[PDB]
Design a protein around this ligand. Structure first.
Ligand code: CL
Length: 262
């Protein structure tokens, strides 16, 4: 028995729906430490401790741009913290530091008897996500903290394209027509630079820079893939190996690549 496997056996329909099987509650962090603000989403009875994921927005953006991931992932068995940065103009390195600080506070709250997530988190199992500069920050977080178990940035933005040291399983969401973090000069070179890890590249057909944000028109496919990736690698849950590693074979995807996934 995989001690980290949670919830009923997955189906395409259960992964494509707006929410998974778990009931989700949330709270705003009272005294954020090391970042601007945060909302914690958690499942009320996942059947055991679950991993934690920290999600960071992009330049000038706030929690609303990435908020949909909170309920979506939490409803499948994760504690998710979506954060506002100290300043909306923070750079990827600062975003990475605040992302890790948010994860540290989730771990601290896990040991605080007054917190709603008291005893709900397996603090040894954590992941990182984020949009644009927050996606670049997620990759920096993975490079600097190889104990992280999964990463799934979307339209990542960073001055470098060489993340060759990353050993964390990394799923890159890309948007075909991105004019802010262009695929050919950012997302794809970042993907190609990683030779040590399970990795995946999923490009949304005709998508703009915000193609993976709250309110996007591909929440069924993007949500399915994001949850499947997190489940497969944060929980070592091989029930999700096919969903995580498969080509969707969908006209909504203009480019799909994967390596070392199974
Ligand atoms: Cl950005």
């Amino acid at each position: 028995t995989n001690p980290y496997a949670r919830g009923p056996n997955p189906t395409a329909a259960s992964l494509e729906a707006s929410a998974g099987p778990f009931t989700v509650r949330s709270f705003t962090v009272s005294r954020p430490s090391g970042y601007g603000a945060g909302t914690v989403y958690y499942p009320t009875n996942a059947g055991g401790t679950v991993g934690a994921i920290a999600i960071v927005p992009g330049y000038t953006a706030r929690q609303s741009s990435i908020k949909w991931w909170g309920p979506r992932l939490a409803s499948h068995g994760f504690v998710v913290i979506t954060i506002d940065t100290n300043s909306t103009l923070d750079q990827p390195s600062s975003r990475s530091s605040q992302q890790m600080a948010a994860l540290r506070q989730v771990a601290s709250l896990n040991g605080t008897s007054s917190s709603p997530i008291y005893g709900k988190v397996d603090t040894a199992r954590m992941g990182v996500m984020g949009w644009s500069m927050g996606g670049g920050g997620s990759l920096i977080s993975a490079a600097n903290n190889p104990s992280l178990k999964a990463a799934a940035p979307q339209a990542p933005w960073d001055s470098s394209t060489n993340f060759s040291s990353v050993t964390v399983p990394t799923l890159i969401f890309a948007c075909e027509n991105d004019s802010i973090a262009p695929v050919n000069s950012s997302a794809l070179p970042i993907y190609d630079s990683m030779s040590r890890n399970a990795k995946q590249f999923l490009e949304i057909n005709g998508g703009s820079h915000s193609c993976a944000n709250s309110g996007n028109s591909n929440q069924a496919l993007i949500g399915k893939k994001g949850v499947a990736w997190m489940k497969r690698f944060m929980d070592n849950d091989t029930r999700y190996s096919t969903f995580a590693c498969e080509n969707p074979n969908s006209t909504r995807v203009s480019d799909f690549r994967t390596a070392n996934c199974s």
